[PDB]
Amino acid sequence: MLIGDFSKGYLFHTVAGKHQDLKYISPEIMASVLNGKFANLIKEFVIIDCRYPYEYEGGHIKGAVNLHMEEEVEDFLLKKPIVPTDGKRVIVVFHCEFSSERGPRMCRYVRERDRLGNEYPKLHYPELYVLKGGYKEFFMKCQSYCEPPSYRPMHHEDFKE
DSSP states (O other): OBOTTSSSBOSSOOBOOSOTTSOEEOHHHHHHHHTTTTTTTEEEEEEEEOSOHHHHHTOEETTOEEOOSHHHHIIIIITSOOOOOTTSEEEEEEEOSSSSSHHHHHHHHHHHHHHHTSSTTOOSSOOEEEETTHHHHHHHHOGGGEESSOOOOOOOOOOOO
16 A cells, blocks of 8 residues: 555565554565665665664664664654655664564554644654564574674573473
């Protein structure tokens, strides 16, 4: 279908994901954008890494911004909008650990807040995607696009005994 403001269709190809109401992209598509594939069509490409700052610091997609809390997302994306829209696309990609729950949640959060502060169907961020597989998959497949080229996951409790 079309993007959030119904003015055009999605630029990237999408893969099926858990939440059928959202658009997912694979690490291959993600890597191609980073290779500059759509440089001429995109005004701003925002990659929102929702992981804990410590994970993010240990290795994140190059150019990604760490916005772990809804309040940070509010301040970052939603507080400073508009900019020279110029007819080119503004795209935001969201991901977390394995892009399950926090990623999709933040994505829906940005849309709702955007909707609220606008007259239907205008949006400052009419095109949003969730990176399928999160940073884990992307790292294993596209380590060279990560900064630093490392992966530092959080610890989990082995206590369940």
